[PDB]
């Protein structure tokens, strides 16, 4: 249980990283969204989620190097929320 | 098998409730589209895949904390329904 | 309290340089845009740039010529606009505006009005 | 670029009676859309942000409304405090850009 906590810190830890710095590579280019706090925030949640619904996505080179940074670290840190969770929840299944 | 149950049907309340709650969250905002119930559940389910095609998503802060929810519980329930067809699978490989 | 403090006025020759400054109070967070917009009289407003105090990137509106240089100093809690050869097309208020990276300007300065004249 | 389309640049109006300010954007910009004041002489005030949403100390006198490229600033029942300069502003695409401004006569 105290691994699933670490886990969870850093995944919020690049979710909120990727969402500053995001804005920080963005802003500047023209007809870049992915420019205030926000919305680059709910933009990496789907991206460590790999869900990726593409209503947000950058267009800079540093904010495309930001979005494979929270790939690689948030899908992984997703992926060890998710194992954690699943874990538990297949405990209870053998306490009926 | 019992425990595959269980998470199927878990997968199922966080769609329907993702679905339901989606709705009460996005009307109100001028633009959203996720905002009927049949095509709300479209969005749960693309989102819990982790396909998310995005043809529709939330656009409201209480909207995307209901899309959080659903990735959490829906992926990591989806993923355990994914396993388990997968280990029934690779029985019937050892059978021949 | 006055949440952003600018000088009244600035007097430049033609093809001298001027810095104005844009001093802030209240709170600050690192989310914190300072921009700067310039009017000139009987005119609208004008978007001339942004910089982020808490990592020092500034950009620039794209579509005027570049004569300014964004800078900031997070000790005094300042913004500073470096204005350098200028010309009569540059008599204007300018103003500096607060946005906590969400995309509105929620306060502003009073202006500095800027005369270029000999 | 975003261009913001502030037209009529002039609205007269009678006291107390409901005004309308009209911005367009050239495409757009979900709901992404701020308006402020500017008096004679004064600084630029917030009056309304993403679209409708009010401002605490704005009078309620004041909303917005729309979506995606029309927007609409309302004063129902003029007074004459209300005499200034409105302009709307956008944040949904860098860079930020202005509306040309309309003027409200009483």
């Known amino acids: 249980w105290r691994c699933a906590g670490a886990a969870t810190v850093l995944l919020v830890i690049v979710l909120l990283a990727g969402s500053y710095l995001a804005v920080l590579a963005e802003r500047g280019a023209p007809g870049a969204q992915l420019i205030t706090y926000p919305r680059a925030l709910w933009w990496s949640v789907a991206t460590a989620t790999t869900v990726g619904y593409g209503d947000l996505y950058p267009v800079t080179l540093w904010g495309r190097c930001v979005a494979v940074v929270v790939m690689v670290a948030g899908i992984t840190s997703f992926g060890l929320v998710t194992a954690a969770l699943a874990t538990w929840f297949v405990g209870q299944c053998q306490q009926q | 098998w019992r425990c595959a149950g269980a998470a199927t049907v878990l997968l199922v309340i966080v769609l329907l409730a993702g679905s339901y709650l989606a709705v009460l969250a996005e009307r109100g905002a001028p633009g959203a589209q996720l905002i009927t119930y049949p095509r709300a559940l479209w969005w749960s389910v693309a989102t819990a895949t982790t396909v998310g095609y995005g043809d529709l998503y939330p656009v409201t802060l209480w909207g995307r904390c209901v899309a959080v929810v659903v990735m959490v519980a829906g992926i990591t329930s989806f993923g355990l329904v994914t396993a388990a067809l997968a280990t029934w699978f690779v029985g019937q490989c050892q059978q021949q | 309290q006055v949440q952003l403090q600018q000088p009244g006025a600035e007097l430049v020759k033609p093809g001298a340089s001027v810095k104005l400054s844009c001093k802030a109070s209240?709170?600050?967070?690192?989310?914190?845009?300072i921009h700067w917009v310039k009017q000139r009289p009987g005119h609208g407003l004008e978007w001339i740039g942004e910089i982020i105090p808490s990592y020092g990137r500034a950009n620039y509106n794209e579509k005027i010529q570049k004569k300014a240089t964004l800078t900031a100093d997070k000790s005094s809690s300042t913004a500073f606009m470096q204005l350098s050869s200028l010309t009569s097309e540059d008599s204007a208020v300018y103003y500096c505006?607060?946005?906590?990276?969400?995309?509105?300007?929620?306060?502003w300065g009073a202006g500095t009005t800027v005369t270029v004249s000999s | 670029d975003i261009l913001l389309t502030q037209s009529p640049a002039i609205l007269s109006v009678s006291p107390g009676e409901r005004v309308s300010f009209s911005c367009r954007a050239s495409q757009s910009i979900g709901t992404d859309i701020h308006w402020y004041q500017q008096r004679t002489n004064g600084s630029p005030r917030l009056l309304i942000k993403?679209?409708?949403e009010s401002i605490s100390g704005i009078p309620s006198r004041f909303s917005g409304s729309g979506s995606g490229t029309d927007f609409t600033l309302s004063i129902n029942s003029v007074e004459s405090e209300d005499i200034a300069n409105y302009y709307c502003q956008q944040s949904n695409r860098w860079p930020f850009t202005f509306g040309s401004g309309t003027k409200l006569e009483i």
């Open positions: 209240g709170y600050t967070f690192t989310s914190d845009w």
């Open positions: 505006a607060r946005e906590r990276g969400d995309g509105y300007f929620a306060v």
């Open positions: 993403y679209a409708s």
